[PDB]
């Protein structure tokens, strides 16, 4: 497990996790707020 | 005698196995094949003997269960509507399903899955660890699962309750007879499958057709040729 945990601790795995998290956050924001351009409320 | 023995194949095998007719053209009983430690590959003499005897027992059960309903339906023993062909019982719904059963075929399939998964997984755990199933409490009948040195022949108060084979000579005779009838059953089940595919009828019907018309009803005429 700790060998597997250090494998997930490697740079490409945490990079993939960050990319998935950021892409999902931005996609859900754009879906639930369709076409945001002007900062108004 | 030796049934089609091939030379340069008895170099790696002596006479210990029941049949051991020396027939090994391709070569799979060589200890050089899959040599090392651990589980390894599935081509090893221990697993080969175990799978051969298990295939033999299953094919013997299948040959008996494919012969008995048709023969007993030709007589007055079992009723005729329960004497359907072995492929029409529900094993292949394109071939036929016996609708007059006490349960749905998938319900029987699930009951079979639970029961035979229990049986075969206990068998596998005893194959990997000999005598291990006699230690963990099952129902109080753990002593029935003592096993033996050979995984193929566990024995005990249930598998050998008749206690046949007290000495070595008749035990070797029984093992040789079991493997001979089992190999005959492999051939029998092979023929049953081929006859079912290319005739669409029961094996006893094919036997009666060959007996009544030897030249007019055989493999050549069943393929359309003359």
């Amino acid at each position: 497990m700790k060998d597997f945990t250090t494998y997930l601790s490697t740079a490409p795995v945490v990079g993939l996790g960050w990319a998935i998290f950021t892409s999902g956050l931005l996609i859900e924001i754009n879906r639930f707020f369709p076409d945001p351009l002007v900062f108004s409320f | 005698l030796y049934v089609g023995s091939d030379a340069a194949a008895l170099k790696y095998l002596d006479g210990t196995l029941p049949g051991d007719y020396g027939f090994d053209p391709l070569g799979l009983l060589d200890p050089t094949v899959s040599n090392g430690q651990g589980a390894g590959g599935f081509v090893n003499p221990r697993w080969l003997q175990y799978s051969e005897v298990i295939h033999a027992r299953w094919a013997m059960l299948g040959a008996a269960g494919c012969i008995a309903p048709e023969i007993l339906g030709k007589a007055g023993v079992i009723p005729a509507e329960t004497a359907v062909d072995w492929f029409r019982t529900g094993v292949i719904p394109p071939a036929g399903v016996y609708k007059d059963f006490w349960a749905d075929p998938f319900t029987l399939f699930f009951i079979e899955v639970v029961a035979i998964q229990f049986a075969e997984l206990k068998r596998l755990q005893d194959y990997k660890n000999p005598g291990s199933q006699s230690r963990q409490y099952f129902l109080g009948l753990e002593g029935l699962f003592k096993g033996s040195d050979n995984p193929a022949y566990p024995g005990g108060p249930f598998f050998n309750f008749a206690n046949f084979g007290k000495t070595e000579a008749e035990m070797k005779k029984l093992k040789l007879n079991e493997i001979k009838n089992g190999r005959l059953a492999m051939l029998a089940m092979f023929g049953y499958g081929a006859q079912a595919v290319i005739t669409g009828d029961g094996p006893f019907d094919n036997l009666l057709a060959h007996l009544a018309d030897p030249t007019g009803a055989n493999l050549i005429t069943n393929l359309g040729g003359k």
């Binding site: - | 719904p93 349960a103 699930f110 755990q125 990997k128 963990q136």
Partner: protein, 217 residues
């Protein structure tokens, strides 16, 4: 409580981190989870809270379905929330955030008791010192154990084993509830009386789901 104990499969080799000390330790871990002691105690706490909520929810579902079969005007366990908020004085939105508000305190206390054992029973919460102190990892005791049958070690151990076994059975019950409600669209007690009415025919193979029918022949 170890060594020659019944495992999840006879003849299996138990893991090194599963020595049988924990309740329900059958040596079942193909994926080698709970190897680290901190992850082991996290897994024990997670299993305990999932078990407790599983038996609570399954008991509520069974009680409501039994009363509905007997004649009480109770809806099915599925889509009960719709009629619940229809008859609730409290609307949705406020209800879930209210539940989160009175849940965050207990969850924070549980998490910081799991990370720091005995730190909750320091008089910080309304001057409570003897109470709110975890006797074990996922077994707080104190105010949560008013009657003291857990003082005996043997009684505590057998109660832990019974609790974890009934909790795992409750996970299986909840999974079965979801599966055969998606398959039959009926109450679990309705499925039970259908199975005890015609056991040889009414089963998982006759609902039109689970086992698919394509040729019908």
């Amino acid at each position: 409580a170890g060594a020659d104990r019944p495992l999840w499969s006879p003849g299996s080799q138990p893991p090194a981190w599963l020595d049988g000390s924990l309740a329900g330790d059958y040596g079942f871990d193909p994926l080698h989870l709970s190897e680290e002691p901190e992850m082991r105690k996290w897994m024990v706490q997670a299993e305990l809270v999932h078990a407790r909520w599983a038996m609570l929810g399954v008991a509520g579902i069974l009680f409501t379905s039994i009363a509905a079969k007997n004649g009480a005007p109770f809806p099915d366990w599925y889509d009960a929330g719709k009629e619940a908020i229809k008859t609730s004085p409290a609307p949705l939105g406020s209800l879930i955030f209210t539940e989160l508000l009175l849940f965050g305190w207990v969850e924070t206390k549980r998490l910081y008791d799991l990370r720091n054992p005995g730190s909750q029973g320091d008089g910080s919460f309304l001057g409570i010192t003897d109470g709110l102190k975890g006797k074990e990892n996922g077994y707080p005791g104190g105010l949560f154990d008013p009657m003291g049958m857990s003082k005996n070690e043997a009684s505590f151990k057998e109660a832990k084993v019974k609790e974890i076994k009934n909790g795992r059975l409750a996970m299986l019950a909840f999974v079965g509830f979801i599966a055969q409600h998606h398959a039959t669209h009926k109450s679990p007690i309705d499925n039970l009386v259908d199975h005890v009415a015609d056991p040889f025919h009414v089963t998982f193979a006759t609902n039109g789901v689970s086992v698919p029918h394509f040729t019908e022949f």
